[PDB]
Design a protein around this ligand. Structure first.
Ligand SMILES: [C]C(=O)[N][C]1[C](O[C]2O[C]([C][O])[C]([O])[C]([O])[C]2[O])[C]([O])[C]([C][O])O2[C]1O2[C][C]([N])C([O])=O
Ligand SMILES: [C]C(=O)[N][C]1[C](O[C]2O[C]([C][O])[C]([O])[C]([O])[C]2[O])[C]([O])[C]([C][O])O2[C]1O2[C][C]([N])C([O])=O
Ligand SMILES: [C]C(=O)[N][C]1[C](O[C]2O[C]([C][O])[C]([O])[C]([O])[C]2[O])[C]([O])[C]([C][O])O2[C]1O2[C][C]([N])C([O])=O
Ligand SMILES: [C]C(=O)[N][C]1[C](O[C]2O[C]([C][O])[C]([O])[C]([O])[C]2[O])[C]([O])[C]([C][O])O2[C]1O2[C][C]([N])C([O])=O
Ligand SMILES: CC(=O)N[C@@H]1[C@@H](O)[C@H](O)[C@@H](CO)O[C@@H]1O
Ligand SMILES: CC(=O)N[C@@H]1[C@@H](O)[C@H](O)[C@@H](CO)O[C@@H]1O
Lengths: 142, 142, 142, 142
């Protein structure tokens, strides 16, 4: 059993991102999302699956999907932004298991990743605990 | 714009169901899940999409996925229980748009539905507001 | 360090109680309230303090304050209902340290307590784990 | 009826502040705290009362209480930090109605306030809507 506990940091008062969706991929006996002591906790039944969080800022027409998982016993993460209205977390989460560019992101097994949207705002995931079964990460909104 | 506001009633202190997943289907410009005054609010861009909530009782090995949406301008609902580990809300939500046994449930446009798991526990959805833009439902865990 | 983890059960779809307030008394190095896996967790720095939760049903003009603590190394609980508009949880929590009838409730060190409001609805606290530093309780709304 | 809707911005991934307490003062027929679309909403019956939020960073031994309300039909705010274990939100909220050093802060009817703790971390409240029934504020953690 793995857990990934996520702390969300919203660094600028320009815009307001709110949680809108949390999904679990079906591999490795699935997983769950819990809220624990102000953090988002993804629990997974083994190595080889993942979960996604979507955040939306309706003030500024911005959004992103942040995905966290374990691939071949190493943690991974990705962020997708510039989302179409069809790109919910349900959609994005699944694409990491068949879409070459998404597959690659997962295979990279990154301890940190950042990307910016077309509006110039950057988002980042930073794993603070990178080993073991109780992983920890910061999700930083620029 | 449609909203479905859901009040959850957990009625029996045997086991404990906790929220573990909330998904949005990609049709009709997608949608969002918000927590509002103790209720779950599914917001959708138009008719033809849906969202799912999964609840799990770890203590009793029980779970279900409750799905809510609008089909041909009428509200619908369904509950799936006796879940395998592979049947996350991400999986179940998607099945309502291609899997015949799920398609037909959506097409039924039900104002109420109830089902039992293998242990005999009943789960119910009852829409209290069945018309207009802002729909309301009770999710009752037996 | 003590924890009291509380599972809330709302047993009837008549009315809807929502959380509106959570307070910590100042004795025994204070305490905190956390949301953990769908439960309300009161953490306290020792024996001799408590915390309160207030729930309101605006549909039916009903409310109550449920208080949980440890007195002389034994758990206690109480419920106050038929609240005046001045009886917030901030007020009620404090009254267990100076008001004779409230003092008595605390001194009783009950593993279970129930009371009904003037409208005929009963509320109950039931400790499922009654010993140790990780106590557990059901808050049952009739 | 007044509302104050609060957006929380945690801006620095050093330490992690989590919500631990939310209180309502008893004047003006009291009030409630609700979570609405990722925001904290304080609702009050009329002018002359307030509510407090406490946040704690366990990893860095930091904490603060942020208080919001309406005094003589104008919004007010304050932040207290460098807290002892005995300074819960229940304690601090009440002090604004009898303790001169707190009374004067309420009477100031501030649209913005900022303060630093002993470690040099700044905390700020800025009202973005300063007039009418439905007030809005940012709570910024430095
Ligand atoms: C161990 C790991 O991680 N692996 C992985 C996987 O996961 C898996 O899946 C399966 C089905 O297919 C099941 O579910 C199990 O349980 C799990 O574990 C997958 O995910 C993949 C993607 O697709 O990836 C990974 O792997 C790689 C390869 N295939 C090998 O094996 O090596
Ligand atoms: C109107 C309605 O409701 N319709 C429906 C639909 O939805 C849709 O989808 C599309 C794609 O395909 C888009 O997204 C839009 O936007 C929407 O609206 C669908 O969902 C279906 C299922 O699949 O169902 C319904 O319909 C009926 C028929 N099929 C038609 O199409 O018309
Ligand atoms: C141990 C116990 O529990 N005790 C108690 C108390 O608590 C206390 O308090 C103090 C001040 O006063 C401090 O804070 C400390 O820390 C604590 O611990 C109190 O609370 C009381 C009520 O008032 O009760 C109890 O006790 C009894 C008597 N006093 C004896 O001691 O025994
Ligand atoms: C109008 C206003 O805001 N006022 C105020 C007050 O509030 C009040 O309170 C009372 C008792 O005392 C009752 O609760 C009512 O309802 C209300 O409204 C108070 O709070 C104060 C503080 O303590 O402050 C304000 O005011 C001024 C003067 N002091 C008078 O009284 O007028
Ligand atoms: C702007 C944007 O969202 N780019 C994403 C990138 O972050 C992600 O790593 C990749 C694979 O999923 O898909 C897109 O290229
Ligand atoms: C109807 C009602 O709320 N009664 C309460 C009772 O439950 C509580 O035990 C006592 C001491 O706090 O105060 C009141 O009598």
């Amino acid at each position: 059993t793995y857990t990934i506990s996520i702390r969300v940091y919203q660094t600028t008062p320009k815009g307001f991102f709110r949680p809108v969706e949390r999904t679990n991929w079906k591999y490795a006996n699935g997983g769950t999302w819990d809220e624990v002591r102000g953090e988002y906790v993804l629990t997974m039944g083994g190595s080889g699956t993942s979960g996604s969080l979507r955040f939306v800022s309706s003030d500024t027409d911005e959004s992103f999907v942040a995905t966290f998982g374990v691939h071949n016993y190493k943690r991974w993460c990705d962020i997708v932004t510039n989302l179409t209205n069809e790109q919910t977390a349900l959609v994005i989460n699944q694409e990491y298991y068949g879409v070459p560019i998404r597959d690659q992101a997962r295979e990279n097994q990154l301890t940190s990743y950042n990307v910016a949207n077309a509006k110039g705002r950057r988002f980042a995931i930073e794993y603070t605990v990178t080993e073991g079964d109780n992983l920890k990460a910061n999700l930083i909104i620029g």
